């Protein structure tokens, strides 16, 4: 009844396959050095975000649903959804007790403090710090730590309609997958928790609207805080520094 069928189990396996690489170790370099640095600057935070952003691009290209889109459609989705996806990764990797984010391949010793916010754009940093903690707090402990749930939330975020997308076929594909991954997440949660999953399903829209709010208010967070020669270019396409 609530147990997953073969088609649902297959959909989940495909998702897990696409995300292979997300939790891999970092090669020696600028980004890894920034993550291991005890005293991190805003540029170091940008260097760290670069790793996750690149990995999101790689994941998306491994998903058959994504490759049904035109190249412009793909671009529009990644551009529109990246900050929300990063925020969801943030929820997966955050610890309220230590007040910090960690990465799966490295001990909990290496981390990024929630207080990194305090070095960013003074006009908006305190509000963004509050928004992230507020968003984190809505999640049940065992839901935020579930890689499949997090992966599905990321995919629902990615496959969200954008007014930037005009192509009729792309728009159809995006809407279809938004509903597909939403339905799959609900079925997955029902398979684990039965009727208790109904309450979690009802919270999905709350999560999505809060994510959108975070994305819509984060764009100037790094303004005036970074020397471009010290920060990876990819995150600077999403967060204006000058």
């Amino acid at each position: 009844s609530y147990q997953l069928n073969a088609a649902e189990l297959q959909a989940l396996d495909l998702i897990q396959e696409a995300f292979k690489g997300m939790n891999d170790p970092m090669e020696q370099g600028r980004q890894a050095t920034s993550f291991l640095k005890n005293e991190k600057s805003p540029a170091d935070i940008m260097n760290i975000m670069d790793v996750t952003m690149r990995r999101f691009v790689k994941m998306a290209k491994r998903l058959p649903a994504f490759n049904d889109l035109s190249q412009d459609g793909k671009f529009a989705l990644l551009k529109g959804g990246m900050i929300e996806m990063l925020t969801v990764r943030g929820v997966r990797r955050f610890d309220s007790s230590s007040g910090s984010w960690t990465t799966p391949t490295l001990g909990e010793s290496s981390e990024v403090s929630i207080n990194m916010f305090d070095q960013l754009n003074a006009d908006v940093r305190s509000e963004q710090k509050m928004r992230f903690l507020q968003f984190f707090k809505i999640f049940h402990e065992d839901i935020r730590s579930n890689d499949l749930v997090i992966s599905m939330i990321m995919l629902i975020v990615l496959f969200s309609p954008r007014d930037s997308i005009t192509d009729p076929e792309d728009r159809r594909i995006i809407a279809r997958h938004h509903e597909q991954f939403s339905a799959l997440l609900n079925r997955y949660l029902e398979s684990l928790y039965g009727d208790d999953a109904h309450q979690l399903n009802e919270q999905l829209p709350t999560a999505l609207r809060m994510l959108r709010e975070i994305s819509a208010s984060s764009g100037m967070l790094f303004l005036g805080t970074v020397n471009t020669s010290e920060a990876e270019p990819l995150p600077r396409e999403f967060f204006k520094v000058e």
């Binding site: 691009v57 290209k61 793909k74 551009k79 990246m82």
Partner: peptide, 13 residues
């Protein structure tokens, strides 16, 4: 114009 994002999206990984 998000040139690097586009480049990464369109490359052969």
């Amino acid at each position: 114009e998000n040139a690097l994002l586009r480049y990464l999206l369109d490359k052969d990984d």
